[PDB]
Amino acid sequence: SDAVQRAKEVLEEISCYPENNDAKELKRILTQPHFMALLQTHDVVAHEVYSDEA
Amino acid sequence: GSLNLERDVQRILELMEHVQKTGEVNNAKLASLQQVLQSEFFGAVREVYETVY
DSSP, rough: OOHHHHHHHHHHHTTTTTOOOOHHHHHTOOOTTTHHHHHHHHHHHHHHHTTTOO | OOOOOHHHHHHHHHHHHHHHHHHHHHHHHHHHHHHHHSSSHHHHHHHHHHHOO
């Protein structure tokens, strides 16, 4: 679920960079119970793809 | 006729590239967001979501 975070992660850096509250909001709004929810529903396997051999 | 979020999913790549015009936003991460935003899995998975819904 870190791969998906990388998406909004960019916003984390934008926290310093004063950008369009709307634009920055686009990346934020991009995280809904539909999309961001799907990412967590797909990242499950994505993360499992490399199941810790441990 | 569909969710705006999906439509904005593409238009977002525009705003991102616009805000990234500040320099102080390593396009590395910004671009990384595009890889996920432009990810095919989004539509592939999104398809199931709609199916289930």
